Design a protein around this ligand. Structure first.
Ligand code: HEM
Length: 280
């Protein structure tokens, strides 16, 4: 029963783009780290129907890399617009107690918005990983555009989880004009631009209640002209891929690092990688 465990998360609003070749960078394994748990969330269009047939290649490439490192895939779940995969080092697993469960929440009739929660237990501590997706236009349970639903929040339960992570595009944007956002970016005034970011506004409205984002030090991860580092100012620069954490039982969770991966340049959005240490 280790005192601490490490967790890496990634999310990428990747659209139609296919898993890049350099998965080690994407997962934060390129400096020799061996985290205990890894979660990968993606948002896009048509994963389920899998018309480009990227499905088989995804499995093969992720499985090859991670199985050699001693990971077991607990669950992969895909909808039309979301994917969530969770991996755990096989050595931590006990079949009797693992209680591996996943739910999908569909909030419209087109099954396009909502979320996924995958949860499991190790050392009698329960982990939950959520991703979610909301479009600007939908009628929602919160009467906001934000990709929060109480059904996806396992801190609210009578049997709440110990360690929870929410990764993806929360549909939180920077609420200022493009000119002024670009100006703040050019000055590297990240906190100044974050003053316009909607996460704090969603929290004021008691959404994402008790959920913490690690300090953001990196520039907005959208919208880029593909294969450049230049913003396309047809959209106001925004942080579209986020990692939040909390415990539902007062456990300590410590962010180790939180960064966009600016080398993945082929799409309009940059993926975001977070690293954590949890105390059981
Ligand atoms: C860079 C973007 C993407 C990332 C990071 C990603 C990640 C993943 C991961 C981690 C898995 C499970 C791997 C495993 O089994 O260990 C998976 C499976 C899958 N993905 Fe993605 N994926 C991406 C793009 C796509 C796209 C564009 C499509 C199709 C439009 C797609 C369709 C599928 C399908 C069908 C599966 C499950 C296949 C099976 O279980 O037989 N993915 N993806």
């Amino acid at each position: 029963p280790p005192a601490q465990l490490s967790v890496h998360t990634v999310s990428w609003n990747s659209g139609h783009e296919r898993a890049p070749t350099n998965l080690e960078e994407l997962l934060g394994l390129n400096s020799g780290e061996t985290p205990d748990v890894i979660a990968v969330a993606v948002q896009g269009f048509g994963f389920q129907t899998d018309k480009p047939q990227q499905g088989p290649a995804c499995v093969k490439n992720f499985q090859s890399l991670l199985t050699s490192k001693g990971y077991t895939k607990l669950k992969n779940t895909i909808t039309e617009t979301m994917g969530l995969t969770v991996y755990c080092l096989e050595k931590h697993l006990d079949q009797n107690t693992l209680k591996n469960e996943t739910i999908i929440v569909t909030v419209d009739d087109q099954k396009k918005s909502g979320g996924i929660v995958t949860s499991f237990t190790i050392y009698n501590k329960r982990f939950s990983f959520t991703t979610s997706r909301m479009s600007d236009e939908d009628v929602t349970s919160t009467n906001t555009k934000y990709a929060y639903d109480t059904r996806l929040d396992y801190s609210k339960k009578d049997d709440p989880s110990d360690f929870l992570f929410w990764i993806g595009d929360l549909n939180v944007r920077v609420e200022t004009n493009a000119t002024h956002a670009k100006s703040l970016v050019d000055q590297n005034n990240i906190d100044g631009l974050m003053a316009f970011d909607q996460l704090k506004k969603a929290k004021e409205q008691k959404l994402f209640d008790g959920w913490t984002e690690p300090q953001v030090t990196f520039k907005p991860t959208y919208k880029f002209k593909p294969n450049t580092d230049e913003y396309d100012l047809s959209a106001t620069p925004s942080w579209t891929d986020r990692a939040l954490y909390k415990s539902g039982t007062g456990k300590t969770i410590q962010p180790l690092s939180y960064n966009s991966l600016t080398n993945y340049k082929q799409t309009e959005h940059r993926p975001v990688l977070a690293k954590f240490r949890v105390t059981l």
